[PDB]
């Protein structure tokens, strides 16, 4: 069981973890420390209704400008994910167009994976950890805004119950990136060869790190299914928005908060 092949998979897991820590300053451990009130370094202010929203002032249709703004604020995350992908052995040797295709689909799913770290069943961290926007306040907002985030909370609560740590997430994210079923991929085999090795490393990592969870490997692969559906649901959201006839005004502070989400 402990042999050259398994040692190689442990070495790959460590390599990915080390690159993950270098690429992503916002780790899961840091987020959970804030959410469970462990960090006394300026604890986050809770925004739970319109009154606390205004007490919280510490921050071209409305919805479209929200999406423009969150996509612009996500540039740094996209750059971090791309930097991480360069560290995945074999990735930069793929055809450049396939590297771009892999990242152009993978980044959204990874952003949602990392957004889950900022979420619990009560709400989500915002303003670089200075605020906490409640789930039910978001859900209470007028259509179509009230439905924006709830499916991501539903995903995040289930995902977080797997209790993955940053060591786990490093490999999971690499597996997402090396998805050979992306539309428009030219050379699928060298991608699947890498992903197969990453999947072996993930299997071993979950066995060593999660004695409590039988079928965790399968459960985590099912989460990749839920991430894609969250991304594709954005196409439906855009159609809902265009067909909305009712007032879509939104408090400027709520627009700014939504630009911090995804």
């Amino acid at each position: 069981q402990l042999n050259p092949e398994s040692a190689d998979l442990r070495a790959l897991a460590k390599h990915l973890y080390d690159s993950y820590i270098k690429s992503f300053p916002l780790t899961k451990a840091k987020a959970r420390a804030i959410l469970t009130g462990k960090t006394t370094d300026k604890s986050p202010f809770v925004i739970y209704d319109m009154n606390s929203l205004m007490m919280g002032e510490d921050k071209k249709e409305v919805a479209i400008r929200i999406f423009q703004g969150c996509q612009f604020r996500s540039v740094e995350a996209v750059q971090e994910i791309t930097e991480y992908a360069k560290s995945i052995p074999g990735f930069v040797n793929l055809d450049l167009n396939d590297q771009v295709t892999l990242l152009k689909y993978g980044v959204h799913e990874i952003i949602y994976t990392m957004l889950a770290s900022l979420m619990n069943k009560d709400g989500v961290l915002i303003s670089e950890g200075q605020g906490f926007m409640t789930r039910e306040f978001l859900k209470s907002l007028r259509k179509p805004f009230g439905d924006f985030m709830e499916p991501k909370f539903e995903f995040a609560v289930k995902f977080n119950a797997l209790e993955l740590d940053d060591s786990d997430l490093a490999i999971f994210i690499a597996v997402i990136i090396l998805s050979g079923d992306r539309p428009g991929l030219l050379n699928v085999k060298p991608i699947e060869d890498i992903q197969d090795n990453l999947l072996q490393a993930l299997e071993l990592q979950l066995k060593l790190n999660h004695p409590e969870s039988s079928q965790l490997f399968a459960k985590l692969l099912q989460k990749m299914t839920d991430l894609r559906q969250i991304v594709t649901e954005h196409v439906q959201l855009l159609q809902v928005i265009k067909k909305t006839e009712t007032d879509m005004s939104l408090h400027p502070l709520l627009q700014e908060i939504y630009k911090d989400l995804y």
Binding site: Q71, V75, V78, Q79, T82, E83, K86, V92, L96, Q99, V100, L103, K104, V107
Partner: peptide, 11 residues
Amino acid sequence: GLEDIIRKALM
């Protein structure tokens, strides 16, 4: 816009 960002980051 996204593809451009990724291509520049890959340089």
